[PDB]
Amino acid sequence: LVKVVFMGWFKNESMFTKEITMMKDDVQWATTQYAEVNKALVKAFIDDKKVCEVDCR
Amino acid sequence: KNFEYTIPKFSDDDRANLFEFLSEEGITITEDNNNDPNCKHQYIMTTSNGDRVRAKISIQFQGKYLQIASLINDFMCSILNMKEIVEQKNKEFNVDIKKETIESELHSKLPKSIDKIHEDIKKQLSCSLIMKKIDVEMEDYSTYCFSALRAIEGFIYQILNDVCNPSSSKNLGEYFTENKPKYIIREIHQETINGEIAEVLCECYTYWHENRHGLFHMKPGIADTKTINKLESIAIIDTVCQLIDGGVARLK
């Protein structure tokens, strides 16, 4: 159970950001969802380090 | 589309080779030349379509297409051990839990569906039900939804998988099409699906898709720190089990 920050970039180079506290094992899936929903590239950081990335643009 | 996933720990061999079989059905894996060398092995994971992937080293994948992505994920759920979590929480929390308790809660939740659904699903649902056990109030409950959503998602496959057994192993959207109320099966599949099965599928999909959409849609230009309320989460967890339990009964 950790705090995660998600960072996303839309096709147009706009940006979005989220902070959530959630169980670690869901992070990738979560990351996957953000990208799939928004057609975005999302990176997920825990403790300032990048644990996952997905791209759906 | 591309992705990278970096997994700390993992396999210690057992999981990795363990992991590979499943991917066995059906993708092609082959060793590849390892250059700069903190990495024991490098592999290429392949498909008829034209997928690619990587390794390895405490392991990393980078890949052309999402599809291997899913498989790797399902497995990790597979690793998933219920007993296993329990120690962690208390250590996380004062609270002490008889794991065997939950099933009571869980069984209670899916009275007619308990033994008719894949274990993988249960595990996710059981995870979501942790919330009922813990008295401490909390900042965010979203995680609980996430489990819920995951379960339902799996549930859809389980049906899909049985009803149409496809080599392709595609995605949920693929089967579904958009109508202003409940979603509907794509015309292409209506021949095969075309049921009360369909209704169950659509009832479920529709719940998943919007909640997924509600939770993960982001406004551009924003830096959300919002949190999901408890009731807010309960409605969801509870609602899902009903669909799942209800679906099984309705589809005897």
CB A8 within 8 A of CB B218: yes
Contact B220/A12, CB-based, under 8 Å? yes
B181 lies within 8 A of chain A by CB: no
Distance between CA B119 and CA B165 in Å, rounded? 19
Give bridge partners of residue A45 from the DSSP assignment.
Answer: A5, A50
Whole-number Cα distances in Å, B3 to A20, A40, B52, B53, B63: 21, 12, 11, 9, 6
Same domain as B67, residue B110: no
Residue B50, phi then psi, degrees to nearest 5 = 125, 40
This PDB structure is determined at a resolution in Å of 3.1
CB B205 within 8 A of CB B156: yes
Q: Which residue type, as a one-letter code, is found at position A29? A: W
User: How many independent structural domains does chain B possess?
Assistant: 2
Distance between CA A36 and CA A33 in Å, rounded? 5
Distance between CA B96 and CA B119 in Å, rounded? 24
Same domain as B140, residue B42: no
Of the partner residues A15, A26, A37, the one whose CB lies closest to the CB of residue B212: A37
Last residue of a domain, one of B36, B64, B81: B81
B44 in helix, strand or coil? strand
Same domain as B172, residue B74: no
Burial of B178 by CB count in 10 Å (0-12 exposed, 13-18 middle, 19+ buried)?
exposed
Contacts of B46 (CB under 8 A, 6+ apart): B27, B28, B29, B30, B52, B53
Largest Cα–Cα distance of chain B, in whole Å?
Answer: 57
Query: In B, which residues are within 8 Å of A55 by CB distance?
Result: 1-3
Same domain as B172, residue B52: no
Running DSSP on this structure, what letter comes out for residue B85?
A: H
Same domain as B18, residue B6: yes
What is the nearest CA distance from B252 to chain A, expressed in angstroms? 31
Nearest to B150 by CA among A44, A29, A55: A29
Whole-number Cα distances in Å, B151 to A9, B55, B79, B197: 28, 29, 16, 18
B5 lies within 8 A of chain A by CB: yes
Contacts of B106 (CB under 8 A, 6+ apart): B114, B122, B125, B126, B129
Of the partner residues B6, B218, B225, the one whose CB lies closest to the CB of residue A16: B218
Same domain as B149, residue B54: no
Contacts of B19 (CB under 8 A, 6+ apart): B11, B72, B75
Same domain as B66, residue B184: no
Neighbours of B75 (CB within 10 A): 18
Distance between CA B126 and CA B107 in Å, rounded? 10
Same domain as B60, residue B156: no
Last residue of a domain, one of B53, B81, B109: B81
Same domain as B145, residue B99: yes
For Cα atoms B70, B166, B15, give the angle at the middle one, nearest 5 degrees: 35
Same domain as B188, residue B70: no
CB B199 within 8 A of CB B108: no
Last residue of a domain, one of B81, B109, B137: B81
Same domain as B65, residue B39: yes
Q: Is the peptide bond before B26 cis (omega within 30 degrees of 0)?
A: yes
Of the partner residues A1, A14, A50, the one whose CB lies closest to the CB of residue B220: A14
User: How many independent structural domains does chain A possess?
Assistant: 1
Alpha helices in chain B (DSSP H): 14-22, 67-79, 82-92, 99-109, 119-128, 130-133, 142-163, 172-175, 197-216, 230-250
Element (H, E) at A34: helix A27-38
Same domain as B33, residue B88: no
Whole-number Cα distances in Å, B29 to B154, B167, B195: 26, 18, 38
Residue B11 domain boundaries: 1-81
B1 lies within 8 A of chain A by CB: yes
Interface test with B, best of A28, A55, A56 (most B CBs within 10 A): A28
Nearest to B218 by CA among A9, A55, A2: A9
* CB-side neighbour CA atoms (13 Å) of B71: 23
Contact A40/B218, CB-based, under 8 Å? yes
Chain A residue with minimum CA distance to B78: A25
Residue A33, phi then psi, degrees to nearest 5 = -65, -40
